[PDB]
Design a protein around this ligand. Structure first.
Ligand SMILES: *CC(=O)CC[C@H](N)C(=O)O
Ligand SMILES: *CC(=O)CC[C@H](N)C(=O)O
Lengths: 292, 290
């Protein structure tokens, strides 16, 4: 009975949020409640189970990287994308440097138009246009030294296809798209089904793009803990420094597969939700979710 | 019809060997290509140079690592070696040498006996050391000796340098054919359960740890490219071998172990023609684990 388990596990793991804390280098993100922990799982017949702070909005942050990657592949095609970004753990698209490159190749002659495409791909997946947290965006834009450094770096080396301020606008706004555990569990369910939207009953991401997305998640989705998660959790997963984890299991419980949206704002030293990570590992182990 | 398919695909991919190169004893045929696929019910399909012997080379890092976990346990091994792409990753030379050094045994002979006893549990026999290969590695192994002393310096070797190097270069020179690697693959596919012996030969959590390493770091600097275009745990050796596996999930519904051999190596250190064949099978038979 997964629902009861998830309630107990959220109860159990919530206290460990004392071992890390919220993000600091984006100040509007340092202001969030640190004991928060929530989870949603979505099945392809539309059954969902949630527990904890499952319905608190947060910014997607690095989660948005898999969206823009997918959006860039749908727009320019895989070959175009893989010539400018690497798939090895030219920079990796899960990393800021690769993600900045990806932002700069989104179709359009301005930031606004690069972002309209992104937003419109995102509507396709979650069924609404997403809210941009301007407060979070504003504070990142003031303080984005490292990203402007990288972006000038990429531009010097011919890896950008937009101007710096433009690319940084698109990148910092995608990071500030807001989500619930619910929206990320749906994007995760869709990826589990190879770009097939199991509620809308249509193909929303091409299957090969969705395969490339899953591989990058398993391989580089959890920053510098990716091998660890692969070894002890075994589920393709993508974290964001705001404490979100998007994970998924391909088609125990959840036989037809599932999407998972987790939120736990206290993060660890690797940059991943502390309590969200603990919970995901528990589920993976208890319900034998590992895909190898 | 997987068998006729495997025949046609070996025939098709064979010539591409011309784009690659064999790795000193290792440089002495370029165009060989073999494959073996084994299922839990014991049926095996094979094609090309499927029964030609070769040295395991880096494929042995997987056995070594498994063997180190079994004796010392997972916690201890992971303090000394990293799981990511300071400790080094057991799939690269530095982490493989650390692993060799923490095998149990008061000597290089003992350590190797421990490794052969685990090897024999998997494959049903004691493996042969190609001493030609071993000895011509022994003499030209400067790079490996650099690393080993480095590791000793930084307290990440738990044995003596010459002793560690002997174990390591010896596991490298262990022999197999596509067949033995297909069997190890199957067992890994089945989480350490040996489907023909019907016993648990590797603990489950060590086998998962193994597969994760393969998926993540088994193909050197093409591991991401494999995961994204093949999507099957795979481990290469510089002598042209690839061990791959498919966990139980139209064909190979129960999973399988795959052994490939193609001595023409690409820029990345992976069998050129072996990688192409594996990609074609994964793609044609929808083997990807993602
Ligand atoms: C990676 C992540 O979770 C947030 C990305 C953030 N905007 C950055 O530091 O680049
Ligand atoms: C991985 C591989 O095939 C190289 C092993 C080789 N003997 C070495 O350099 O240690």
């Amino acid at each position: 009975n997964p629902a009861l388990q998830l309630h107990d596990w959220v109860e159990y793991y919530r206290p460990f949020a004392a071992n890390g804390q919220s993000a600091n280098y984006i100040p509007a993100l340092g202001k969030v409640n640190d004991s928060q922990l929530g989870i949603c799982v979505l099945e392809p017949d539309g059954t969902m189970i949630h527990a904890g702070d499952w319905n608190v909005s947060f910014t997607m942050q690095s989660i948005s990287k898999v969206i823009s990657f997918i959006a860039a592949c749908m727009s320019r095609g895989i070959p175009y994308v893989l010539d400018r970004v690497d798939v090895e753990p030219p920079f990796n698209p899960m990393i800021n440097a690769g993600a900045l490159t990806i932002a700069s190749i989104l179709p359009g002659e301005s930031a606004y138009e690069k972002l309209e495409f992104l937003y419109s791909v995102m509507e396709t997946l979650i069924g609404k246009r997403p809210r941009i947290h301007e407060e979070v965006f504003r504070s990142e834009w003031e303080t984005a030294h490292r990203n402007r450094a990288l972006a000038y770096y990429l531009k010097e080396t011919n890896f950008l296809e937009a101007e710096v301020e433009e690319t940084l606008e698109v990148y910092l706004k995608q990071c500030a798209m807001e989500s619930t555990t619910e929206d990320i569990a749906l994007i995760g369910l869709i990826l589990a089904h190879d770009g097939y939207h199991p509620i809308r009953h249509e193909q929303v991401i091409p299957k090969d793009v969705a395969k490339l997305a899953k591989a990058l998640m398993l391989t580089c989705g959890m920053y510098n803990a990716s091998g660890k998660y692969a070894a002890f959790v075994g589920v393709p997963a993508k974290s964001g420094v705001s404490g979100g984890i998007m994970a998924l299991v391909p088609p125990q419980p959840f036989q037809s597969g599932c999407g998972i949206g987790i939120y736990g704002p206290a993060i660890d030293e690797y940059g991943n939700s502390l309590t969200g990570g603990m919970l995901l590992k528990h589920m993976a182990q208890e319900w034998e979710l590992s895909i190898f």
